[PDB]
């Protein structure tokens, strides 16, 4: 479908944009999941909100200054929490001369400047802010309520994992970054850029994710010895030049305001914002995710890490494997090429 495993972009119609899980199944039947990341441009008629001028008083409770130490393309990020502030105050600092986007011509140049100054002048990132900018009237691709099998966690156990089953807002500025990682429980994720400067992504094909983990393990021996899944700490930055040097397949894409970005199970990604902007994100699942969720390597060196019991999914969608699973005898091996079963509708 997509032998190159290259990042794909789709342009659904309003008729296709209405059923979320169905469209995901469609793009997967086109090989979108292979790259581990895909872009989805919503129809021109679609708008999640009428205007984004009524949020200047929105509070960003825990802003973080992103300190970075490293060399030769390998870095570690330490997020320092700063005093709360409103979007208004954040916008002013974001656009200020000291934190504003540098002058440039092409992306390649800005990308070079990012990797060149990422350890200098630590930026502030209004990350992981509970909330949504979606008008409660929109029923298409509403991040606050996608209606995927992931809801079983809340509807069945009455448990709310913020950012995972609830919306998160991200207010970034030039040079703010998100480290290499896969979603918690290796779930899917949806990212919409409400407004502002772009956001660039780097993604590694799921079928090659293990070799990125091994490369990471090598670069950071101590962190690996202390936690098999240390990358879930979201503190590891790795330049594309390093990735290419060690033979790790990958691709890059720049998201623009008004565009959706979808990450798939076990799809490693990382990136940065070109300037002041706002994005909403949350996780979601499909029947294909279940297996990834069952075999997901977790982090236990820390408290409060996202943990989801796979029992309700195995019992419901894999009843004929439940008894063997509970016994810890399930030997299922995942084939990262296969699209989710719901895609069989578009296979004929």
């Amino acid at each position: 479908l997509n032998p190159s495993a290259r990042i794909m972009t789709f342009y659904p119609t309003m008729e296709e944009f209405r059923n979320f899980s169905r469209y995901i199944a469609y793009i997967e039947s086109q090989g979108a999941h292979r790259a581990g990341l895909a872009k989805v441009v919503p129809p021109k008629e679609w708008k999640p909100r009428a205007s984004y001028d009524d949020i200047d008083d929105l509070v960003i409770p825990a802003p973080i200054q992103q300190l970075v130490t490293g060399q030769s393309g390998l870095f570690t990020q330490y997020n320092i929490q700063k005093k709360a502030m409103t979007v208004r105050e954040f916008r002013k600092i974001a656009n200020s001369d000291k934190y504003c986007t540098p002058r440039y011509s092409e992306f390649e140049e800005l990308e070079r400047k990012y990797w060149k100054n990422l350890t200098f002048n630590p930026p502030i990132y209004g990350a992981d802010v509970n909330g949504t900018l979606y008008e409660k009237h929109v029923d298409e691709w509403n991040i606050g309520r996608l209606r995927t099998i992931l809801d079983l966690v809340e509807k069945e156990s009455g448990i709310t994992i913020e950012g995972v089953n609830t919306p998160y807002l991200y207010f970034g500025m030039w040079k703010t970054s998100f480290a290499w990682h896969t979603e918690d429980m290796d779930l899917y994720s949806i990212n919409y850029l409400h407004f502002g400067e772009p956001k660039s992504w780097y993604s590694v094909p799921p079928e090659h994710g293990k070799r990125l983990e091994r490369l990471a393990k090598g670069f950071f021996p101590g962190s690996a010895q202390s936690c098999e899944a240390f990358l879930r700490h979201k503190m590891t930055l790795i330049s594309p030049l390093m990735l290419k040097k060690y033979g790790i397949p990958f691709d890059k894409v720049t998201q623009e305001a008004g565009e959706f970005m979808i990450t798939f199970p076990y799809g490693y990604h990382a990136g940065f914002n070109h300037g002041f902007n706002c994005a909403e994100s949350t996780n979601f699942a499909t029947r294909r995710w279940i297996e990834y969720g069952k075999q997901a390597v977790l982090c236990s060196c820390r408290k409060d890490m996202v943990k989801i019991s796979m029992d309700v999914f195995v019992r419901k969608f894999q009843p004929e494997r439940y008894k063997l699973w509970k016994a810890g005898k399930d030997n299922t091996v995942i084939d990262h090429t296969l699209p989710t079963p719901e895609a069989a509708e578009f296979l004929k």
Partner: peptide, 12 residues
């Protein structure tokens, strides 16, 4: 408990 926690990573 078996299920829980939150996406927001630990901050320094």
């Amino acid at each position: 408990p078996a299920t829980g926690g939150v996406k927001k990573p630990h901050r320094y």
